[PDB]
Amino acid sequence: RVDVMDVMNRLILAMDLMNRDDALRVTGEVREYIDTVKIGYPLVLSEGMDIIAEFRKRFGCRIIADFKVADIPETNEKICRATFKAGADAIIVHGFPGADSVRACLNVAEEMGREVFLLTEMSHPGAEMFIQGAADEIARMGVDLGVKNYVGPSTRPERLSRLREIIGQDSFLISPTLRFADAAIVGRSIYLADNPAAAAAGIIESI
Amino acid sequence: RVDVMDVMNRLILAMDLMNRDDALRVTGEVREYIDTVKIGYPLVLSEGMDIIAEFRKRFGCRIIADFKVADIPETNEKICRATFKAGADAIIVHGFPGADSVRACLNVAEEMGREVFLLTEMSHPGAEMFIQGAADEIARMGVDLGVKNYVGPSTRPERLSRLREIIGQDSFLISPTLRFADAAIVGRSIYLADNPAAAAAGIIESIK
């Protein structure tokens, strides 16, 4: 779709390593295959938010900040602003705290020309307690907030089809598959391999 | 209670300013009144996690990292480890991602001799959609995880009473009141006051 982001080869690298040296090396090695990198708090808290600018200046990749923003509106605004100021192209936000908390993020993204991804569901065991039962309503909330980017569950493809049904065929969906999601997120299979470059190439083949 | 933290004057400063210069100045000014400071992401993302060590080395205050940790277990473990390595005494964790996500934090806290606070509820308008209806079950989950520290809702004192009922009289409870909570969190009234020291002193007077 023309109005949503273009992720090279439909493959997003989850760069979950926590030391700067290792993180930069792997990302560079796969830049020929991947143009979009997701980074989270363990890396940025350990190495500093300046690492975002480094990924972009060294490799020219898009950066998605997987910060699972989950505060009150005013604090969400400030987290998003700081994250976008640091150079992130997009930020991942929880829906469980409700519509106003999500809208605060959307407001800053609108101001700064950046993107918000709504996290609709998670697939770790504890997700059954509260997250699973809220997922459809969170997705619908996103639709009613004009959200265009979503992060769906890692497991259970049939959950992915349900999500795709709620959000429509136009919205951008990423998941940790490609019959429903627009891009797949991959981590260990790439950044732990002895040859990250080869791993990415191989995954793209089957894709 | 002897087995939970002692917060000086039952008053925790929410240091929500985002520039290091302003943050440090205010905290120093109130150190005579407050020994426990809560820091969140806007400050640490803007200035670096090294700012935690600075608060502690300059002022010797306890630091609570209000990071509302809300990821899968493995990622929660890493966030907690990084935050404790930086010197935080405690970290605030969401309950809505479930018991395993909370336990991951408790595991690291146990390893490192630090504390986890479970956030049971929030009071901003959007909280009605999912958080309000999950609050009691999240508090009960905390009890069933051996959680000793809780953060409750800012408004509705009767909600604080319900929370205190679930967690028992022993557990440590903080809230943004002191008939149910062990300590109160205060932000703007202090850090956006003409003289922070006087504001802190005045609030403390209200508290007997």
UniProtKB/Swiss-Prot annotation, chain A:
Question: What SMART domains does UniProt report for this protein, alphabetically?
Answer: OMPdecase (SM00934)
Task: Enumerate the Gene Ontology biological process terms.
Answer: 'de novo' pyrimidine nucleobase biosynthetic process; 'de novo' UMP biosynthetic process
Gene Ontology CC terms, in alphabetical order: cytosol
Q: What EC designation does it have? A: 4.1.1.23
* Residues annotated for substrate binding in this entry: 16, 38, 66-75, 123, 187-188
**Its domain of life?**
Archaea
Residues in the active site? 68
Q: Which CDD domains match?
A: OMP_decarboxylase_like
Q: Per the similarity annotation, which family is this?
A: Belongs to the OMP decarboxylase family. Type 1 subfamily.
Whom does it interact with, and what assembly results? Homodimer.
Q: What is this protein called?
A: Orotidine 5'-phosphate decarboxylase
Species whose genome carries this gene:
Methanothermobacter thermautotrophicus (strain ATCC 29096 / DSM 1053 / JCM 10044 / NBRC 100330 / Delta H)
Starting at the broadest rank, the lineage of the source organism is: Archaea, Methanobacteriati, Methanobacteriota, Methanomada group, Methanobacteria
